[PDB]
Design goal:
The PDB classes it as dna binding protein/dna. The entry lists the keywords chromatin, CHD1, remodeler, ATP-dependent chromatin remodeler, DNA binding protein, DNA BINDING PROTEIN-DNA complex. The structure is cut from a larger assembly and holds chains A, B, C, D and E. By secondary structure, chain A is mostly helical. Chain A is built from three helices and no strands. In chain A, helix 1 (2-11) runs antiparallel to helix 3. By secondary structure, chain E is mostly helical. The chains are: A mainly alpha, B mainly alpha, C mainly alpha, D mainly alpha, E mainly alpha. The structure holds one DNA strand.
Chain lengths: 50, 94, 97, 88, 110
DNA sequence: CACGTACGCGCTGTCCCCCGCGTTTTAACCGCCAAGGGGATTACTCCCTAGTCTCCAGGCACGTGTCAGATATATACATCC
């Protein structure tokens, strides 16, 4: 479910939702396919996701 | 000779913010010079913004970027808000 | 009853920073402006407001220069301003550069 | 624990001590106190954020995501720090 | 059916003249075309800046027991507000004076 | 111009912190994918909107008469010596 919601947030870009509870909130959505591969691998690759 | 100034508009703005406070002639000339200086700075910055982007027209976007460049910090973001709402009302009307 | 050296200077500092009158007399400034102007060309007429605007420009420039000079003198562990403080301030501003 | 973040935040310490010493050697400084480097880092951060904020404003007037060199030239030009060698 | 000649400043809810700003932009040699919303936006920005300085100058006149704004009140309002101080830091105000400020080294002993 | 005293400057001590040097690490730099998006041009099409023109009307500026609040006297009641 976490992988699915991260894929939905990246593919339909949701910077406000991708920030969410992060204090810094420094999310880079350049190289969309790289972030999609990271979401397909593990959600813990993203910052403030564990 | 009808000498152009911003006298009555600054006076009614003063009556809006302070209904019981007057103003002197030297302060009025200083306010007129301030309004002319700020208008000249923003118009020159917007003309430069139109020139760098190969645009022959000046719209609200050039004036908005000129306010964001010249006015520093939080003064810019409230000024940008105040102008942006006015354009919305004027569109609703004309 | 004599006063300590320094409290009178502090009284003039607190007095002249409150009032906004011109601290230079009108006629010597007009004579100085006319003498400075007459070498560029002869036969120059001057409006009164032009000499007044030159006067307040000189006031603001010199007061800002003495603030920078006082900061230079305080930085050099002194309370007395010196011409070396003046030439140091103008350079950091770029006038002597 | 191999956990660490992807985004690095200590890049202001990436302007190292010998870099600031080389800058002062170009400036003609013989002796450097130990408290100089943090002040220099703060001054560099303030100057960089001013120039970069103006360059980002110049970029988003053009509806772009890429900060070109000409935007940096214009941002330096508005503050009175005009730079040659990139305008053309 | 020319309905009562409704002005642009009253349409925009502003007090500063929109049409006069439009005329000064057209004759000011900035661009040969000027959009419709640009004088509205510029008049609103000028009105906001004038209102901010006039409010602070009225407060400065109120703290000095005055009902009439003099250039000293404008100077105090500009210099005591740091955003206006770095907006008009390269600006001289005539008959304005300076802020009352004494360096702490020059203060006496106690 | 006279007096007087505070402070700028010179000298000395002292300690501390920065510089010079040697050694070890480490990341900058250069050269590599791997695909994909951003953006600068060239050409084309379309349409909305701002310039231009004519006409008119009311906003702004100037001038003037009045008007309500603030200031300065005119006369009457209460009071001290």
């Amino acid at each position: 479910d976490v992988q699915t919601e991260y894929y939905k947030n990246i593919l339909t870009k949701n910077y406000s939702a991708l920030t969410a509870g992060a204090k810094g909130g420094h999310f880079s959505l350049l190289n969309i396919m790289n972030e999609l591969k990271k979401a397909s691998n593990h959600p813990y690759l993203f910052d403030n996701a564990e | 000779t009808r000498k152009e100034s911003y006298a009555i508009y600054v006076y009614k703005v003063l009556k809006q913010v302070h209904p019981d406070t007057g103003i002197s002639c030297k302060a009025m000339s200083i306010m007129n010079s301030f309004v002319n200086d700020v208008f000249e700075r923003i118009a020159g910055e917007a003309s430069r913004l139109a020139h760098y982007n190969k645009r022959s027209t000046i719209t609200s976007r050039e004036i908005q970027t000129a306010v964001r460049l010249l006015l520093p910090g939080e003064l810019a973001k409230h000024a940008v808000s105040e102008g942006t709402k006015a354009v919305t009302k004027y569109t609703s009307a004309k | 009853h004599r006063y300590r050296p320094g409290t009178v200077a502090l009284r003039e500092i607190r007095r002249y920073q409150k009032s906004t009158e011109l601290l230079i007399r009108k006629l010597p400034f007009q004579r100085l402006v006319r003498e400075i102007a007459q070498d560029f060309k002869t036969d120059l007429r001057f409006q009164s407001s032009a000499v007044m605007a030159l006067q307040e420009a000189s006031e603001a420039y010199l007061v800002a220069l003495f603030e920078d000079t006082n900061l230079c003198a305080i930085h050099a562990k002194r309370v007395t301003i010196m011409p070396k403080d003046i030439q140091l301030a103008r350079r950091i501003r770029g006038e002597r550069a | 624990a191999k956990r660490h973040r992807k985004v690095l935040r200590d890049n202001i310490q990436g302007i190292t001590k010998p870099a600031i010493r080389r800058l002062a050697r170009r400036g003609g400084v013989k002796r450097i106190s130990g408290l100089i480097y943090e002040e220099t880092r703060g001054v560099l951060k303030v100057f960089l954020e001013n120039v970069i904020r103006d360059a980002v404003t110049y970029t988003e007037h053009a509806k772009r995501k890429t900060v070109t060199a000409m935007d940096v030239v214009y941002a330096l030009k508005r503050q009175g720090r005009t730079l040659y060698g990139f305008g053309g | 059916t020319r309905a009562k000649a409704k002005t642009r400043s009253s349409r925009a809810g502003l007090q500063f003249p929109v049409g006069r700003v439009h005329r000064l932009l057209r004759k000011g040699n900035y661009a040969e075309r000027v959009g419709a919303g640009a004088p509205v936006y510029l008049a609103a920005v000028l009105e906001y800046l004038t209102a901010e300085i006039l409010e602070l100058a009225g407060n400065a006149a109120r703290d000095n027991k005055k009902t009439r704004i003099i250039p000293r009140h404008l100077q105090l309002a500009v210099r005591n507000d740091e955003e206006l101080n770095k907006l008009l830091g390269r600006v001289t105000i005539a008959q304005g004076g300076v802020l009352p400020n004494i360096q702490s080294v020059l203060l006496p002993k106690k």
